[model samples]
Target chain A: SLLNVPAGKDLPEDIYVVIEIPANADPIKYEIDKESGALFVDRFMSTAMFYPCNYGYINHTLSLNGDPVDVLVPTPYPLQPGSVIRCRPVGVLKMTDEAGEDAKLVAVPHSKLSKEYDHIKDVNDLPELLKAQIAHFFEHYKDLEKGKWVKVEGWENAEAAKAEIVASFERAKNK
Target chain B: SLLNVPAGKDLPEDIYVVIEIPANADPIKYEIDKESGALFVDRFMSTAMFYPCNYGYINHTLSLNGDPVDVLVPTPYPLQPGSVIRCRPVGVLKMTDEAGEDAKLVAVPHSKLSKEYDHIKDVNDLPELLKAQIAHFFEHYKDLEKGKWVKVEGWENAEAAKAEIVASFERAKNK
Candidate 1:
């Protein structure tokens, strides 16, 4: 079922939502299997941190670095793997890891979490501590992978987030 | 021959270096073959605008997204594809694309370039427009790919850059 579902039709005007599983929400970590290109539970790892946000990727967009553009959705409820949520972009965390160019788009649930997050255009408006935790998770999440940390490229405004959405479609096509 | 060399060992204290091929330095672009896992030249595309910096990736370290960590070296001469250089991290352009997260480490010839750039630690120290153009190239480099732009997450200090170097090596290992 996860394989049959598309990441999304296209970027919406207001914002783009992603349906990624959380790090701690589910006991079993799931991902798109690299070899088969199907969603599967990660057999090698377990979650240590409680990611306060829902994670996922832009539908149909491809990154030159070899993955879908990633997104983070902030919500209270725990969404299971393969769940979908529409959300708006507040900002982005530019990240560099063992791979070339990977970036995380930060957002809030458009209608699910609450309207408080809707119309959110800038990332600065989010709670300062929330941002810190998210940043920390990425920076040190890969300990089992031997302290493989994700570099915080910086943050982007809505315009840049929108630009990334547009570019991602092309990246997927070209890839 | 590209495969013959590793990306790099643990970062040398003096300067962390990378050896990568360019996408548009000449009419022909070069890339690592995904299927073969070997370096190959791309003959299909050409860049009308010249990239102002020497672009490539850390030799041995791989980013989580699926490729080697990328880097940009500011050089006066256009280095050919497969050329290797020893450089130090002056700063980084944190980028995000369709993939999750990617960052670009910016540097100059560690011992090769004039000492004038040696003392330069902040990316802000570089001419503003030069940095702007380099950022532009990454944001809009993939034409047929559509709006596959790389979001500039932020800039990195030398310490963070070195941290990435060390982390990248580790990330690659865990992967």
Candidate 2:
């Protein structure tokens, strides 16, 4: 099953990411059903802005929010939804919504096919304007939804992001 | 005169940027009339995507493309077009188009009001995903225009961006 798939042999540095929504697509939210392990449309985004990056989650892991840990993998082109790709965690975004600490792990593809992104060793290697744009997208993505609030606390380094993956892996094991 | 205004007290590190198009606005292209120093509508972008960041140029500077060096300033909120702002160069996008060697300086606001971005001292400090988004935007922004082509040569560090500014400043002086 997709949810029970291995996190990958490299663990924190390299792991599997199941994409739920590809970058630059319409704001229709698609998610994996925890029970059936099938992709389903959650809902369309209330705002008009589309996703700025590929968003998905790590399999065989769970976050503090009680679902699979969310990950945002940026690429030169959008990967197909339901596709699983190997990615390396570069950093973590410290964000909070109505549910609570909804942080996201930021990563780049780990495959040779994405050699263009091979130089992005860590979050700091990302373009400064691109980082601001991601923060801006999340801050206002839910603007039209009443009573919905999202705040970006800040960012954490790659070490912190690896720690997050490790903790999530443990959580899934314990659960 | 706007074009004749001083680059800025700090020269390369700190510079004056005049916004020609604000972020999240329509795809209408705006440019400053070189002779009269007045903002004019150039044309609308053939594509549907809006400006990903504040697009503008540095005054009293001329790039190899025969215009003031272009800049992309990412801010939390969209600043008004035709407004001048103090910015710090973080990096440069080495891009080429039909005109040849059209590069853009990437920066953040340098005022106390944008303290949120103060931590972003260099290009590496930016989020990796955001960097990819900016590149993606430029790579395809001209897709609909027949015979128009844009190629992103890649990026240079903050020092290179600063040097580009210095060279541009000198070019304006020579002109």
Candidate 3:
């Protein structure tokens, strides 16, 4: 039911994200099996760095890349894989790779545990340096691999991020 | 004469950076003994993450932090500690910590091995995500330490970065 879960229970701004990789963890890429709903090892990171944030995807949302809309939740604490949590979209990282548009939405946990980040209403609200770090991580995360490159165009505000969620949800529903 | 070396030989854009910490190495914080001109272990990093780029400082430059202006050189290959390399300023990370303004200049190697980055003229020319990653690393790199915090205000273009180097050089000479 993971794949069929509603993108958001109430509002588009508050959506569900499934954690596939935890912050500061090793480079093994874990992904959800679309059919079985079980977590599986997809591949190892081609780079030397670890994930800078909690990485996962939004439920019931399909991106143009043909995968669920990827989400990066920045937190001090690491979350386990397969954990689903509610989050508020703050911004989106406009990126492109060999497979094409791989934009990742940036979100903050809607939980009380992460209330320290409650002040972050938009990506700009987050520390500018932290934003750059997240961007840097993804840019060269695939450097060790041959013929693969990632480019981050820039970032969009919360409103645009919400629109992205709405559009992806529509795409998933239609598919 | 590392401390007394000219900030730049030919052009201000072309500056020397001494690598105290290599990329992808452990959390050991290394510093140069100004009197002995030798590398010394300062302390270990308080955080869990490794240095995202080559960490060091510019010669004959003193920043507001009362230390040599820090520089982060992004390279695919790891250069050894105490390595002095010529680099071109691409941008500056405007940051403040407990001590005060601790800006870090972002540069690319002026060596043939890093010629792929020769096309990068400004910070904007580099991948945006990579910039974010660099900022993020410095933002949270001190998270584990008590009473230590880092705020990255924003970034300035290559022109501003060059000015920063020139200003720091003047400060060093005055000192």
Q: What is the interface RMSD of each candidate, in Å?
A: 19.4, 11.6, 8.1
Q: Write the per-residue lDDT of candidate 1 for residues B131-159, one digit (tens) a residue.
A: 76676556544533445656767777777
Q: lDDT of each structure?
A: 0.64, 0.82, 0.81
C-alpha DockQ of every model: 0.01, 0.02, 0.04
Give the number of the best model, judged by lDDT: 2
Q: Which of candidates 1 and 3 reaches a greater lDDT?
A: 3
lDDT string, candidate 2, A4-65, tens digits:
77786689988889999998786689998988989899987645356668999988888887
Per-residue lDDT of candidate 3, residues A78-163 (tens digit): 99998888889999899888887778889998855467778899978977666777777777666656599899899989998988
Each prediction's total of clashing residue pairs, residues at least 3 apart in sequence or on different chains, is 31, 3, 11
Q: List ranges where model 2 is wrong by over 4 Å.
A: B1-175
**Which pairs clash in the backbone of model 2?**
A124-B124, A130-B130, A130-B131
Worst 10 residues of 3 chain A by lDDT: A44-53
Every model's Cα RMSD, please?
21.0, 16.2, 11.4
Off by over 4 Å in 1: A1-18, A33-38, A43-47, B1-175
Residue-level error in angstroms, candidate 1, position B128: 50
| Model number with the top TM-score | 3
Q: Which is the winner by TM-score between candidate 1 and candidate 3?
A: 3
Candidate 1, residues A54-157: lDDT per residue as tens digits? 77776676666767677888776667666767777778787788775567888677755477776566888877656766776666445345545578777777
**Ordering by lDDT:** 2, 3, 1
Task: Give model 3's TM-score versus the native structure.
Answer: 0.54
